[model samples]
Target chain A: MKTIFSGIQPSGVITIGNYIGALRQFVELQHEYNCYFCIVDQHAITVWQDPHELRQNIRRLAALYLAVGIDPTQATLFIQSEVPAHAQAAWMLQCIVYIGELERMTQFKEKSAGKEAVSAGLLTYPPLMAADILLYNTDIVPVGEDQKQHIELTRDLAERFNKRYGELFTIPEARIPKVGARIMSLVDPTKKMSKSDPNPKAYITLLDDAKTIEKKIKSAVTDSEGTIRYDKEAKPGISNLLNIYSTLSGQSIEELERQYEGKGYGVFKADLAQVVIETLRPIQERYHHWMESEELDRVLDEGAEKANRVASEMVRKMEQAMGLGR
Target chain B: MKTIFSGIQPSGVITIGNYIGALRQFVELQHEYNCYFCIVDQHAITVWQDPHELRQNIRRLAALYLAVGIDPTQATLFIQSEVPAHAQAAWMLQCIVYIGELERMTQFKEKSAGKEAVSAGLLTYPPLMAADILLYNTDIVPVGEDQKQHIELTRDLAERFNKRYGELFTIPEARIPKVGARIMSLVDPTKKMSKSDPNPKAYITLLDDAKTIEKKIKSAVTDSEGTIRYDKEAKPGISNLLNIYSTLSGQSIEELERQYEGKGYGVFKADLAQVVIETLRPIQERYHHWMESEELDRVLDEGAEKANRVASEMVRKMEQAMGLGR
Candidate 1:
């Protein structure tokens, strides 16, 4: 089986955007492919994250993975900081990479452009991201479009090093999942839903209780001409809702419109919210249980041990490939 | 006793310049202060090190510390990569520091300028360095002129963090020793001796045998009119030699000049080479013995254990300061 590696930064709340965009896919991929799902706490600190929140986010993300059916026994899931190889490999790769590439990364520019204060971490974020993917000799890296540049860099580094020193790294392919990938904001459907957005109604959160999710969806924006048809250009807000509904329900947009034919937009929205809440009910319940029990820690501990064993061997090989020894 | 922390990257061969300028100071400070000398292998990879060479460099540098009389028993000498907390704390500080400050750092610019490949590790290098100092709750950080900016940034991050979280980090003071601090290249005299310099003659390696040292000194540049007086402006080569002689022998330049008032530059050069060789003899012997023995590994193992105890506790406190617990 081809090994797939992906990491999520524990910076903020994992929203519906994260679920439909990445985690949901991860849960499915765990059964079909060899997968490593890393809650990259180390990467999160590239920008400011409250320490308590960071820890919580890590645990929450891990539990969310378990809740979504990422059986700890079947797939590797862990926190990034728990493994030293990621940072160590990142340091080594930092030398092989050119400064120009890091400077040209779009996410780095967008995040740091207007900020008066930028961390060196912010500037070099992609390299560590590269290390996270490549250290595992991952055959495929699943990243968002925004993070595609980093995967490209990772591929380049792996290919360059392999060519120079012999085939040591697996040149990973970037995998951007089709459909349900980019869940746009409810209020501003033009932009992707972001937890950082100040507006609470902009996205649904994994932790949102039934009442809150319903209330937020009820207040979600839509045009006055409330047609149930999915017209992204004319009715972006309604389109976003339909996309979420269709994705969760596993029905096409066309099928969904036919199923809710002649139903008013308000009635469709209420039904959509109820379906979402019901679909998320088991996950939220499991998340709370994982939080309260030692299962989350146990899963993380096991995942870290497995990842560390694999990564440490890779690091030693990479180091040996570079002609470093005592 | 106030604690002091310092690190040397195990990326290249340690030179006579490193011996006289920094490592020599570390040896002295071990007795006078609570010194923690780290072979920052994690930091070394910030650029890229051959794994075999990195491992060797770590051991070699560690053995050299013992050879140089930095009793590992007295000082907390360890490899940075062995302790995961260094990178963990580094990740935390990366967020608190701004990109503008990191970009403005003169050392980062100077090293990265004109370089084809730049890694994110190079950019985040300062935060890790900051973590190294702050993790030890260091009160003083000895720095060369070039490293002064990194120290300043470290202080800023420490203070900014302490201001919000109460008095946790001790904002360290820069300790630049006035004499024997800045060593000039033997070949150029005008340039600082650096590992980055391509010419072998520019630096005198501690591992350089006596014959090579003599030959290097003989080819050293001097003025046409070889008046042996210390004149940095008129005769930099002679001045640099005098400085090295005085530093190694702990004798005044006037006394040395008087001792060889009538002697030509030839005799003085030969004598200086001998002096340098003898000064390095005991160190070289110890280094050799440590390399052959398991003493360095034992010491490093203990050193890492000790360092982790302190670092893990500090990290916990930092976590609490950030309110990072459920």
Candidate 2:
């Protein structure tokens, strides 16, 4: 099976948008490919985080992944910090990465712009991301549009190492999922839904109850045209809701538009809220179950064990190629 | 006992200068303190290195340390890349280190000056060095005058982490050995002896045979006055030679100057060559013994185990402080 590697930052609660855009796809990808779903707690500290909150988020995110249908038996779901090879290989790759090239990264520019005392890790994160991919000899990296540049960097670093240190790393390609629906913010449809949004009402978290989900959907921004349509530019809010509803209900956008024809905004909004609630209720149940049981810990322990076996072997090869140890 | 840490780069053959100036002090230091002697292979790659040469250098340096009387049972002597905690804690410290601070490092500036495509690791090496020190809860870092600035940065980073993430790290101080001799180049007493110097006759490596040592000393530059002296300003060449001879023979500079009084430069040079030969003969013998036996491998393996026990504990605390893992 071709290997797939993906990293998620454990900074905030994952939203339904995250579930739909990435996690949901990973649940299915595990069967067809060797998958590594890593919670990158190390990357989360590029900016300061409350230690208590950060620790809670790490376990919560891991539990959430399991609840979202990621089978621990089929996929290696591990914490990035738990795997030493990630940081070790990252240091090796950092030596290969040029300062000027890292400085040119768009994410680094955006994150560090106008900020005083920017962390060094903020500039070097791409190398660590590259390590996360190369450690698995990953054939594909499933990342978002925002992370496409990092995957490109991963490929460049892999190729550079192979040339400089002899052929060692398997060059990985970005595998952006086309089938997953893009879920947008409920408050501002112009922006991608984010858990870090200042307004909690702007996004529905994966753990949000049915009532909370219903309220957020009902209050979502929509055009005053009083009609159901899938035109993104003309009606982004309704279009986003329609996208989410159709994806969750397994109905086509045209089918949803026709079914709600002349129904106006109120009925369409209420129906879409039911579709979201139905989608999240079972996930939350599973999440709670995993969080309360020892199974969650057992799965994480096994994931780290399996990940270490593979990653350690890769690091040993890298060390040999780089002449690090006797 | 106060803990002392020192990192040596596995880049080249360590010269007699390195032995007299630093390694000899460590031989004594292990008795009074909890000492860690780390061969920093990770740090060596900030600049390009030949893989084959690098691997040989790492093993050669370790054996040389053993020959110089660094007791593995008393002091930890391990390769930097062999310890995962060094890299893992390095990433955490990198997050605390700022870009402006790293860019301001004198070593980084000097290394990257007029260079195109400088490696990112060159800019970030201080953080890794800091990790090396902090992982052992080091109380003192024995480094050269040139490395004092990096030790200062290590202290700053340690303080910063403690202030931000609770009091976790022990702040380390630079322990510049006052008793150690400063060995200079034979061809140019104005410069420190370096293995990388273009002129092979400029310095005597620890592994140099008796013939090479005799030839190099005979060709050493001295004042035309030809009188034995210890005046650094008036006769830097003779003063440097006096320093080396006095250090190796356990005689004061004054005593050496008196003993060679009225003696021509030729006789003094010949005798000093013999002194160097006698000093290195036993070390070279022990070095060969370690190289030819499994004792070296067993020592390094045990050293890594002892080092890992302490370093892994410190890294766990750092991870806990930073909220890296559950």
Candidate 3:
């Protein structure tokens, strides 16, 4: 099986959008591929984060991964900072990465556009992210459209190393999953749903209770036509709800449209709220259990060990290629 | 005892200038301070390096340290890449370092002047250098005048981390030794002797044989006055030779001047060659022995282990402070 690598930032509350778009796919991908799901806490610090909040987020992300049915046995789930090889290899790759190239990255430019005193980490984050993917000799990196540029840089660096030194790194490809919903905000369907959004009702957090989920879904913005259809351009808000319902209820969009035919927005919104709560209920319970139990710690400890074994081996080869250690 | 951290680039030949200015002082400082002599192979790659040459230089640098009487038992002598904590901590520190500050470093500006496609590592080297020093809780970084800026940045970063997180790092000070000779080049006495000089006769490498030392010293630039006086402005060549002689033979400049009164440049140059040969003979022998023996490898392995023990503990504290790992 091909190796697959993916990283998630442990910054804010993971929303239902995260679940439908990425986490749920990771749960299934683990069985078919040698998977590595890294909680990139290291990357989160490119911008300032409260130390206590960062620590909590790292563990919370790990627990959520397990709660969402990411089997620790099938997938290597660990925090990026826990593995020394990631940073070490990143430094090595940084020596090969050109400043001009890093400066040209769209994400870096966007992040640092109006900002003064931008952290050097913000500029260099791509190499570290590249290191995160390349350390596992990953054949595929499942990332979103925004992350495709970084994956391209990773391939460039890997190929550069192979040509300059001996062939060592496996050049990885970006695998943007086509099946996941591009879930948008309930308040403004034009924007992607984000937990960091100021308005709480804009998104349903995975940790949100059934009551909150119902309220958020009920208050979601929709057109006055009240026609339940998957016409994204004309009815984006209704289409977003239909997408979530299809993903959660395992029913086709056509089936949902027919099932809700002639129904008002009230019925569709109420049933969509139920679908979201049903999906999140067991996950929230498992998240709570993992948070309270020592099993979470044990699983993470073992995951770090396994990750270290693989990453260290790759780092050794990289060091040898660069003529670093004895 | 206070900790002293110093790093040497394993890029080129170790000239006699390096010995008189830094290496010899390190040998003596090892007993007086908790010394960490790191061969910064990682830093060497900020510019391109041949893999084979880099490996050879790493081993050669380590052997030279031992050959020059740097007791591995007293000093922690290891390659930077050997201890994973240096790079790991470097990334953490990078997140706190500002791009504007890094861009303003004199060394980075000088190195990248008129250069296109400058490596990102070149721009961010100071943070990694800071990490190298701070990882050991270094009290004093014994560096040259050129490196004072980096040490200042290291202190700033350590203090910034302390204020932002908690008081975890010991801010380091730059310790510029006053007793060592500021050795000058044979071809151009106005300039400091350097291994990268294109003229082979401009500097004597520690590995140079007695014959090459004699030839280089004999051909050294001197004034036509033939008066052996310690007047640097009037005769930079004779003054530079006198400085080297005083440092190596343990003779005062006044004593050498008196001894060489009314003598021609021939006598002074011949005797200076002998002094240099005598100084390098035993070191060269020891270097060869270490290169051929397994003892060198064993010493480096143990040094890496010792460095890792200290550095890893510091990294753990840093991670805890930064909210990185559980």
Candidate 4:
């Protein structure tokens, strides 16, 4: 099985859109490929976060990862700072990453634009990510288009390290999912669902309770025609609901449309809301269990240990490649 | 005793001038202060170094440190890369350090001027240095005027970290030695003896045997009159040599000038050469001894362990302050 590595911020809030597009996909990949899922707490602080919130977010994100079926036994799931090699290797990798390249990154420019004083970490974040990926000898770093540049930079850093030092790093490939199961904003079907959206009703958070979900689904926009059908272009709202319902219910969009042909949008919307709630029920329960129990700490501890064993070997090789230690 | 931290590059060749000015001062300080003398291999890569040469240099430098009386038991002497906290804390510290602060550094500006693509590490070097100092709770980071800015930045970073997060870091002060022990270049009496100087005859290496030291001193530049007098303005060459001689021999410069008065530059140069050679003989022997013996590895290994015990605790506090882990 090919190795895959991905580092996520411990953002705490995992929207349903995130679950559908990312977390769910990883669940399937764990069976087919070796995977590393890291909650990148180090990366998060490149801006700033409250201490208590940051700590809680790291644990909360880990619990969410487990809840979404990221098997700790099947994949290496850990926190970035927990394993020292990520930081150690990054120190080396940053030496190879040119300041010009970091400044040119669109993400960095967007984040740092107009800011008089931004953290140097904001610029070096990609190099740190490069370390996290290269340490795993990862075959694929599955990311969205927004992160494509970082993956490319990682590949570049890996190649440069090998050429400048020795043949130690394996240059990894980026996999940007072409088949977009992109979950869009419920309020506006044309827009991608973003957690940062000002309107909370525009997105469905994984932790949203039943009434909240029901209210969001009830207020979901559909045309006055009120026909329940998957017409993506002309009737985006209806199409979006049908797609979500079909994805969650395991029924085809055609099957769902046929079943609800005579039904009003209200009935279909209520049923879709219930399907969404029921789908999230087990995950929320598991998420709560992990958060409330002592097992979460044990799992993260083991994860860090497991991650260290593999990563420390890579760090040693990198150190040797760079002539750091005897 | 107050804690002192200092990091030096494993630059392989330590000039006789360097021995008199910097290394000898460190020997004295090691006795009076709890010291951390680190071979900052990680920091060296912010530019570049040959892997094989770098490894040898690290060993060679460690041997020299021991030969010069850096007692491993009394002071924590270790490779910076060996203790993971330096890198780990650096990672966290970099996140807190503003890019503006790094860019404003005179050293960074001088190093990166006109370079279209310098490594990001060049800018972040001070933050890493700050980490090295702060990790040890260093009360004083003894440095020359060149590094005075970095120590001030270290203090600033500590204050910001304490203010931004919980109070965890101890603000460290910079100790810029005001004493005029700065050794001057042999070929150019006005310039400080720099390892990077292209003139081979300008500096004497610690590894330079008796004959090499003798040859460099024999061809040393002086005035046409050739009177061996300690005149700072008219006879910088004689005065420079007098400083090196007095510093190494523990004789007063006034005593040296009186001894060498009207003796001619030839006679003074010959004795000064042997004084340097005899002073360096045991250091060279121990350096060769450590190079050949298994003892170097043991000292560094034990040194790393010793350093890790103290630094790891600081890393834990920094990590906790930053809300990195549970």
Please give, for every candidate in the order listed, the TM-score of chain B alone compared with the true chain B: 0.94, 0.93, 0.92, 0.89
Candidate 2 i-RMS: 0.6
In order, what fnat does every candidate score?
0.65, 0.90, 0.85, 0.92
Which stretches of model 3 miss by more than 4 angstroms? A179-203, A214-275, B179-202, B214-246, B249-275
- Looking at model 2, the pairs that clash are none
Error of 4 at A325 (Å): 1.2
Question: By DockQ, who's the top model here?
Answer: 2
lDDT of 4 by residue, B215-241 (tens): 999898888877766788998887888
The residue pairs in collision within model 3 are none
| Cα lDDT of model 1 by residue, A1-326, tens digit | 89989887777778888888788878778887789999887677777776667777878888888888888877899888778788767766766776778788888887778677776677767768888888888887766566677888888988888886779888899888787778898888898888767788898988888888889888888888867889989988888888999989888999998988878888888898888898889998888888898877878888889999999888888767765433
Tens-place lDDT per residue, model 2, A1-326, is 79999978888889878877788889889999989999998888888889999999998999899998999988999999999999999999999999988999988998788887799999999999999999998998876666788888888999999999899999999877664445788999987787767799999888888888889989999999999989989999988988888778999999998999889899998988888888888898999998898888889899999999999999999999988897
Candidate 2: where are CA atoms >4 Å away? Answer: A179-191, A197-202, A210-246, A249-274, B179-203, B210-246, B249-278
TM-score of each: 0.90, 0.89, 0.89, 0.87
What's the TM-score of candidate 2 when only chain A is evaluated?
0.94
lDDT tens digits, residues B1-326, model 1?
A: 98889888887778877877788788788888998988887677667565666778778888888888888778998888777777668767876887777778887888788877666667778988999999998998766556778898898999998986678999898888787677788889887777546788887888889999999899988887867898889998898899899989999999988988778999999999999999988888988999998777789889989999999899878866764432
Summarize candidate 2's per-residue lDDT along B124-209 as a digit string, tens digits: 99999999999888998776666888999999999999998899888999877564445789999887787667698988989999
Q: How many clashes in each candidate?
A: 23, 0, 0, 0
